[PDB]
Amino acid sequence: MDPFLVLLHSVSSSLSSSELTELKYLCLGRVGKRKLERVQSGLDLFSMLLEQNDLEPGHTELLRELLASLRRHDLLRRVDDFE
């Protein structure tokens, strides 16, 4: 049970290696380096942060914040929606 988790599995396909490469660079130091080593597509990094960091059914200012630096709009609208 986690509407937001399902929202990360869908938006993950709309990120591609391009958006994953951006949030990954900013993650180097912000979230950690070992976290990116385990990541592979996108839902992986969203599963660790949601586990314990700054992600929840109604609290994702950290992840959405990175999307703000990327200057996105469709990804920030869906994520911010479930938030």
From Swiss-Prot:
Highest taxon of the lineage: Eukaryota
Cystine connections: none
Location(s), subcellular: Cytoplasm
Tissue spec. comment: Expressed in a wide variety of tissues, except for peripheral blood mononuclear leukocytes.
Result for mutant: residue 44 to R: Loss of interaction with CASP8. Abolishes induction of apoptosis. Decreased interaction with FAS
Positions of the DED domain: 3-81
Cited function: Apoptotic adapter molecule that recruits caspases CASP8 or CASP10 to the activated FAS/CD95 or TNFRSF1A/TNFR-1 receptors. The resulting aggregate called the death-inducing signaling complex (DISC) performs CASP8 proteolytic activation. Active CASP8 initiates the subsequent cascade of caspases mediating apoptosis. Involved in interferon-mediated antiviral immune response, playing a role in the positive regulation of interferon signaling.
Recorded disease: Infections, recurrent, associated with encephalopathy, hepatic dysfunction and cardiovascular malformations: A condition with biological features of autoimmune lymphoproliferative syndrome such as high-circulating CD4(-)CD8(-)TCR-alpha-beta(+) T-cell counts, and elevated IL10 and FASL levels. Affected individuals suffer from recurrent, stereotypical episodes of fever, encephalopathy, and mild liver dysfunction sometimes accompanied by generalized seizures.
Annotated domain remarks: Contains a death domain involved in the binding of the corresponding domain within Fas receptor.
Subunit structure: Can self-associate. Component of the AIM2 PANoptosome complex, a multiprotein complex that drives inflammatory cell death (PANoptosis). Component of the death-induced signaling complex (DISC) composed of cell surface receptor FAS/CD95 or TNFRSF1A, adapter protein FADD and the CASP8 protease; recruitment of CASP8 to the complex is required for processing of CASP8 into the p18 and p10 subunits. Interacts (via death domain) with FAS (via death domain).
Protein name: FAS-associated death domain protein
Organism expressing this protein natively: Homo sapiens
